Amino acid sequence: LMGSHNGKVSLLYAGDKHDWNATVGYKDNVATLINVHMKNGSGLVIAGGEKGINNPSFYLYKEDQLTGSQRALSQEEIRNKVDFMEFLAQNNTKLDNLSEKEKEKFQNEIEDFQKDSKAYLDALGNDRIAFVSKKDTKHSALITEFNNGDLSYTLKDYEKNVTLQGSLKHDGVMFVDYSFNKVAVFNLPDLNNLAITSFVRRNLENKLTAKGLSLQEANKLIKDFLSSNKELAGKALNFNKAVAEAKSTGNYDEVKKAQKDLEKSLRKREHLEKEVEKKLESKSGNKKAQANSQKDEIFALINKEANRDARAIAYTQNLKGIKRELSDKLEKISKDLKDFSKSFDEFKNFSKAEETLKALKGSVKDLGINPEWISKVENLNAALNEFKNGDFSKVTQAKSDLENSVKDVIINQKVTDKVDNLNQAVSVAKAMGDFSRVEQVLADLKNFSKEQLAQQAQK
């Protein structure tokens, strides 16, 4: 049993099956700061935004499936919910690239996420979570932070203090914060606009020379930057690979090593910077600090173009994922409508329709907000409840209205998608000279039209 004592700061406590104790802080009375202390020596800290911690219970309690009773999460169960949240933080809040071992590990946290994602996404999105790990043999621990849904790793030894936040995969950019200076690292491929004979590289060259620099000095720096960035990115991803292994080993010597390896490259970037400041200093002779601010303006320019490309690449991938996800949902919705337009078509000429409409209703709700499909469903529900206590012509009308409404939206996206392919195909084919792929898209669009003209002709 547990008890809360007030003296706004309250205290949660009870130890044996008693794994933790917390200190909840209040303001205008809403929770603003939870503070979990576990027997492990591991720590959890939650900090609410302007609106404060919503559902503080989420971080401390679970609903027992066998009893219905509220049960306190174990220091293990806590760590695991953080591990699960860390997963989502790394994979743009989606459950796609979930490994089989991760599917074993997260089963329960997957189970409840599946019931209601809100609790998880709201937490991840709105609150400031900080988890400190159980101190390893060498007296070190790892703080795993979550801000604007953004993960941040930081190793603490109980001095060159280094923290790294961001997703290269999903944001296109990530950051290295070290004792204090911040470094932007971009996930751009080898053949990027900054590396190519682009209008962008053209202008980048024009602006670097104009700020007191030789064309061969500017172009050297561009490649030095792109080279530095790429090295940093690898070293960054390396710290993550260490952290991921550490998760199971329980040791931070490898993460310590990865930080040192990363630090090497961070100093390399420092050397690259001062060199520009020098090759700028020995150029006007009136003073040092003007050559520093002028160096900063130059790097800003490069980082600006690097950010624009990396995020645009990242945006396009994330969008591609949404357009696929929606297409899949609609394909599912189309199946549920194909079956309900058979179950009702057999009833019209005992009832089977009740479950197919029950499946379709769920399929539509799964997609998201469409208040005209909710209105179209209540119209069917109203016309159905009015046949029990009366014409069936008012029943078939609301059916065909709902059937037509969803089928038109389904057709509009399926055509949009196909044409967007053709657009790309045509754009690529007239650049490489091979229209063999545009022929494919066309023959598919023809076949889709025939399929849809035949389905219009079967009314």
PDB file of C-alpha atoms in Angstrom, residues 193-351:
ATOM      1  CA  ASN A 193      23.109  20.128 -54.094  1.00  0.00           C
ATOM      2  CA  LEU A 194      26.087  21.520 -52.102  1.00  0.00           C
ATOM      3  CA  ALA A 195      28.357  18.888 -53.764  1.00  0.00           C
ATOM      4  CA  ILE A 196      26.919  19.251 -57.275  1.00  0.00           C
ATOM      5  CA  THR A 197      27.217  21.862 -60.141  1.00  0.00           C
ATOM      6  CA  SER A 198      23.902  23.371 -58.821  1.00  0.00           C
ATOM      7  CA  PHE A 199      22.426  26.893 -58.874  1.00  0.00           C
ATOM      8  CA  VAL A 200      22.727  26.503 -55.056  1.00  0.00           C
ATOM      9  CA  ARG A 201      26.529  25.717 -55.175  1.00  0.00           C
ATOM     10  CA  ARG A 202      26.848  28.556 -57.753  1.00  0.00           C
ATOM     11  CA  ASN A 203      25.291  31.053 -55.235  1.00  0.00           C
ATOM     12  CA  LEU A 204      27.101  29.491 -52.284  1.00  0.00           C
ATOM     13  CA  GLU A 205      30.426  30.161 -54.175  1.00  0.00           C
ATOM     14  CA  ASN A 206      29.297  33.787 -54.973  1.00  0.00           C
ATOM     15  CA  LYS A 207      28.487  34.575 -51.336  1.00  0.00           C
ATOM     16  CA  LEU A 208      31.673  33.039 -49.824  1.00  0.00           C
ATOM     17  CA  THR A 209      34.053  34.988 -52.159  1.00  0.00           C
ATOM     18  CA  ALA A 210      32.087  38.260 -51.598  1.00  0.00           C
ATOM     19  CA  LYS A 211      32.838  37.879 -47.817  1.00  0.00           C
ATOM     20  CA  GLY A 212      36.611  38.128 -48.516  1.00  0.00           C
ATOM     21  CA  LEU A 213      37.664  34.751 -49.966  1.00  0.00           C
ATOM     22  CA  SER A 214      39.362  33.186 -53.026  1.00  0.00           C
ATOM     23  CA  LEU A 215      37.273  30.933 -55.312  1.00  0.00           C
ATOM     24  CA  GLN A 216      39.682  28.042 -54.627  1.00  0.00           C
ATOM     25  CA  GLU A 217      39.627  28.926 -50.870  1.00  0.00           C
ATOM     26  CA  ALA A 218      35.749  28.881 -50.860  1.00  0.00           C
ATOM     27  CA  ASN A 219      35.518  25.611 -52.807  1.00  0.00           C
ATOM     28  CA  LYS A 220      38.108  23.972 -50.477  1.00  0.00           C
ATOM     29  CA  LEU A 221      36.050  25.033 -47.404  1.00  0.00           C
ATOM     30  CA  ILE A 222      32.782  23.689 -49.021  1.00  0.00           C
ATOM     31  CA  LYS A 223      34.310  20.206 -49.426  1.00  0.00           C
ATOM     32  CA  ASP A 224      36.023  20.462 -45.986  1.00  0.00           C
ATOM     33  CA  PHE A 225      32.595  21.267 -44.435  1.00  0.00           C
ATOM     34  CA  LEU A 226      30.763  18.472 -46.347  1.00  0.00           C
ATOM     35  CA  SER A 227      33.631  16.111 -45.404  1.00  0.00           C
ATOM     36  CA  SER A 228      33.593  17.229 -41.685  1.00  0.00           C
ATOM     37  CA  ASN A 229      29.804  16.965 -41.498  1.00  0.00           C
ATOM     38  CA  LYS A 230      29.832  13.373 -42.982  1.00  0.00           C
ATOM     39  CA  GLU A 231      32.537  12.275 -40.437  1.00  0.00           C
ATOM     40  CA  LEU A 232      30.546  13.825 -37.497  1.00  0.00           C
ATOM     41  CA  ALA A 233      27.352  12.122 -38.699  1.00  0.00           C
ATOM     42  CA  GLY A 234      29.027   8.731 -38.710  1.00  0.00           C
ATOM     43  CA  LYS A 235      30.586   9.270 -35.258  1.00  0.00           C
ATOM     44  CA  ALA A 236      27.126  10.480 -34.017  1.00  0.00           C
ATOM     45  CA  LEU A 237      25.391   7.349 -35.374  1.00  0.00           C
ATOM     46  CA  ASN A 238      28.267   5.407 -33.719  1.00  0.00           C
ATOM     47  CA  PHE A 239      27.428   6.824 -30.243  1.00  0.00           C
ATOM     48  CA  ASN A 240      23.842   5.612 -30.855  1.00  0.00           C
ATOM     49  CA  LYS A 241      25.039   2.093 -31.853  1.00  0.00           C
ATOM     50  CA  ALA A 242      27.069   2.023 -28.582  1.00  0.00           C
ATOM     51  CA  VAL A 243      24.022   3.235 -26.498  1.00  0.00           C
ATOM     52  CA  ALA A 244      21.829   0.563 -28.178  1.00  0.00           C
ATOM     53  CA  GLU A 245      24.324  -2.211 -27.245  1.00  0.00           C
ATOM     54  CA  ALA A 246      24.905  -0.683 -23.745  1.00  0.00           C
ATOM     55  CA  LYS A 247      21.107  -1.129 -23.227  1.00  0.00           C
ATOM     56  CA  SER A 248      21.710  -4.909 -22.985  1.00  0.00           C
ATOM     57  CA  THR A 249      25.386  -5.053 -21.720  1.00  0.00           C
ATOM     58  CA  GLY A 250      24.782  -2.577 -18.867  1.00  0.00           C
ATOM     59  CA  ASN A 251      28.212  -0.943 -19.521  1.00  0.00           C
ATOM     60  CA  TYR A 252      29.026   2.606 -20.699  1.00  0.00           C
ATOM     61  CA  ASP A 253      32.788   2.111 -21.477  1.00  0.00           C
ATOM     62  CA  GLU A 254      31.861   1.707 -25.213  1.00  0.00           C
ATOM     63  CA  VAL A 255      29.635   4.860 -25.094  1.00  0.00           C
ATOM     64  CA  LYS A 256      32.588   6.542 -23.232  1.00  0.00           C
ATOM     65  CA  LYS A 257      34.802   5.367 -26.179  1.00  0.00           C
ATOM     66  CA  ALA A 258      32.272   6.560 -28.835  1.00  0.00           C
ATOM     67  CA  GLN A 259      32.071   9.982 -27.114  1.00  0.00           C
ATOM     68  CA  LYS A 260      35.936  10.229 -27.223  1.00  0.00           C
ATOM     69  CA  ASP A 261      35.898   9.149 -30.943  1.00  0.00           C
ATOM     70  CA  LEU A 262      33.165  11.788 -31.629  1.00  0.00           C
ATOM     71  CA  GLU A 263      35.137  14.404 -29.620  1.00  0.00           C
ATOM     72  CA  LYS A 264      38.186  13.803 -31.926  1.00  0.00           C
ATOM     73  CA  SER A 265      36.074  14.870 -34.989  1.00  0.00           C
ATOM     74  CA  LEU A 266      34.514  17.790 -33.037  1.00  0.00           C
ATOM     75  CA  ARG A 267      38.037  19.232 -32.457  1.00  0.00           C
ATOM     76  CA  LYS A 268      38.716  18.555 -36.217  1.00  0.00           C
ATOM     77  CA  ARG A 269      35.718  20.894 -36.992  1.00  0.00           C
ATOM     78  CA  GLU A 270      37.170  23.449 -34.500  1.00  0.00           C
ATOM     79  CA  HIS A 271      40.528  23.323 -36.409  1.00  0.00           C
ATOM     80  CA  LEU A 272      38.650  23.830 -39.757  1.00  0.00           C
ATOM     81  CA  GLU A 273      36.895  26.915 -38.283  1.00  0.00           C
ATOM     82  CA  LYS A 274      39.975  28.778 -36.851  1.00  0.00           C
ATOM     83  CA  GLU A 275      41.814  28.108 -40.149  1.00  0.00           C
ATOM     84  CA  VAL A 276      39.108  30.133 -41.982  1.00  0.00           C
ATOM     85  CA  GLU A 277      39.327  32.863 -39.278  1.00  0.00           C
ATOM     86  CA  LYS A 278      43.179  32.996 -39.877  1.00  0.00           C
ATOM     87  CA  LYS A 279      43.012  33.019 -43.755  1.00  0.00           C
ATOM     88  CA  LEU A 280      40.529  35.926 -43.150  1.00  0.00           C
ATOM     89  CA  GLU A 281      42.672  37.675 -40.450  1.00  0.00           C
ATOM     90  CA  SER A 282      45.819  37.924 -42.630  1.00  0.00           C
ATOM     91  CA  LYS A 283      43.850  40.007 -45.241  1.00  0.00           C
ATOM     92  CA  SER A 284      43.061  43.593 -43.947  1.00  0.00           C
ATOM     93  CA  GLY A 285      45.344  44.498 -40.937  1.00  0.00           C
ATOM     94  CA  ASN A 286      43.594  47.260 -38.878  1.00  0.00           C
ATOM     95  CA  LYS A 287      43.365  45.594 -35.396  1.00  0.00           C
ATOM     96  CA  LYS A 288      41.056  39.551 -34.935  1.00  0.00           C
ATOM     97  CA  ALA A 289      37.380  39.637 -33.702  1.00  0.00           C
ATOM     98  CA  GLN A 290      36.172  41.077 -37.051  1.00  0.00           C
ATOM     99  CA  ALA A 291      37.756  38.016 -38.802  1.00  0.00           C
ATOM    100  CA  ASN A 292      35.848  35.783 -36.272  1.00  0.00           C
ATOM    101  CA  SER A 293      32.368  37.382 -36.915  1.00  0.00           C
ATOM    102  CA  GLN A 294      33.128  37.325 -40.677  1.00  0.00           C
ATOM    103  CA  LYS A 295      34.068  33.591 -40.356  1.00  0.00           C
ATOM    104  CA  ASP A 296      30.736  32.943 -38.479  1.00  0.00           C
ATOM    105  CA  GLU A 297      28.680  34.647 -41.302  1.00  0.00           C
ATOM    106  CA  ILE A 298      30.383  32.324 -43.854  1.00  0.00           C
ATOM    107  CA  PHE A 299      29.657  29.065 -41.918  1.00  0.00           C
ATOM    108  CA  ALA A 300      26.085  30.265 -41.296  1.00  0.00           C
ATOM    109  CA  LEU A 301      25.586  30.483 -45.144  1.00  0.00           C
ATOM    110  CA  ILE A 302      26.882  26.900 -45.672  1.00  0.00           C
ATOM    111  CA  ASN A 303      24.859  25.468 -42.678  1.00  0.00           C
ATOM    112  CA  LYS A 304      21.785  27.298 -44.061  1.00  0.00           C
ATOM    113  CA  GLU A 305      22.026  25.519 -47.457  1.00  0.00           C
ATOM    114  CA  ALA A 306      22.955  22.217 -45.752  1.00  0.00           C
ATOM    115  CA  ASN A 307      19.815  22.545 -43.481  1.00  0.00           C
ATOM    116  CA  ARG A 308      17.527  23.390 -46.481  1.00  0.00           C
ATOM    117  CA  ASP A 309      18.608  20.199 -48.403  1.00  0.00           C
ATOM    118  CA  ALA A 310      18.741  17.728 -45.443  1.00  0.00           C
ATOM    119  CA  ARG A 311      15.207  18.733 -44.225  1.00  0.00           C
ATOM    120  CA  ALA A 312      13.775  18.738 -47.772  1.00  0.00           C
ATOM    121  CA  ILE A 313      15.172  15.164 -48.218  1.00  0.00           C
ATOM    122  CA  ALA A 314      13.697  14.219 -44.782  1.00  0.00           C
ATOM    123  CA  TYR A 315      10.341  15.898 -45.534  1.00  0.00           C
ATOM    124  CA  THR A 316       9.963  13.988 -48.805  1.00  0.00           C
ATOM    125  CA  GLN A 317      10.592  10.624 -47.099  1.00  0.00           C
ATOM    126  CA  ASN A 318       8.151  11.307 -44.234  1.00  0.00           C
ATOM    127  CA  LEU A 319       5.476  12.458 -46.727  1.00  0.00           C
ATOM    128  CA  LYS A 320       6.033   9.285 -48.825  1.00  0.00           C
ATOM    129  CA  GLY A 321       5.315   7.312 -45.616  1.00  0.00           C
ATOM    130  CA  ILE A 322       1.989   9.191 -45.003  1.00  0.00           C
ATOM    131  CA  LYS A 323       0.815   8.842 -48.668  1.00  0.00           C
ATOM    132  CA  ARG A 324       1.545   5.057 -48.367  1.00  0.00           C
ATOM    133  CA  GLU A 325      -0.189   4.784 -44.875  1.00  0.00           C
ATOM    134  CA  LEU A 326      -3.328   6.613 -46.156  1.00  0.00           C
ATOM    135  CA  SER A 327      -3.381   4.501 -49.357  1.00  0.00           C
ATOM    136  CA  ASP A 328      -3.266   1.294 -47.252  1.00  0.00           C
ATOM    137  CA  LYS A 329      -6.063   2.555 -44.916  1.00  0.00           C
ATOM    138  CA  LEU A 330      -8.239   3.464 -47.971  1.00  0.00           C
ATOM    139  CA  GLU A 331      -7.481   0.100 -49.640  1.00  0.00           C
ATOM    140  CA  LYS A 332      -8.750  -1.550 -46.361  1.00  0.00           C
ATOM    141  CA  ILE A 333     -11.826   0.793 -46.301  1.00  0.00           C
ATOM    142  CA  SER A 334     -12.495  -0.161 -49.971  1.00  0.00           C
ATOM    143  CA  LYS A 335     -12.534  -3.913 -49.066  1.00  0.00           C
ATOM    144  CA  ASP A 336     -15.026  -3.357 -46.120  1.00  0.00           C
ATOM    145  CA  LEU A 337     -17.283  -1.357 -48.552  1.00  0.00           C
ATOM    146  CA  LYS A 338     -16.983  -4.075 -51.292  1.00  0.00           C
ATOM    147  CA  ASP A 339     -18.288  -6.703 -48.770  1.00  0.00           C
ATOM    148  CA  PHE A 340     -21.088  -4.452 -47.331  1.00  0.00           C
ATOM    149  CA  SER A 341     -22.243  -3.721 -50.978  1.00  0.00           C
ATOM    150  CA  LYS A 342     -22.724  -7.544 -51.333  1.00  0.00           C
ATOM    151  CA  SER A 343     -24.280  -8.247 -47.854  1.00  0.00           C
ATOM    152  CA  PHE A 344     -26.881  -5.477 -48.414  1.00  0.00           C
ATOM    153  CA  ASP A 345     -27.353  -6.315 -52.149  1.00  0.00           C
ATOM    154  CA  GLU A 346     -28.407  -9.886 -51.084  1.00  0.00           C
ATOM    155  CA  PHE A 347     -30.734  -8.545 -48.270  1.00  0.00           C
ATOM    156  CA  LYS A 348     -32.437  -6.106 -50.740  1.00  0.00           C
ATOM    157  CA  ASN A 349     -33.398  -8.998 -53.149  1.00  0.00           C
ATOM    158  CA  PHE A 350     -31.893 -12.963 -42.439  1.00  0.00           C
ATOM    159  CA  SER A 351     -29.669  -9.829 -42.033  1.00  0.00           C
TER     160      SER A 351
END
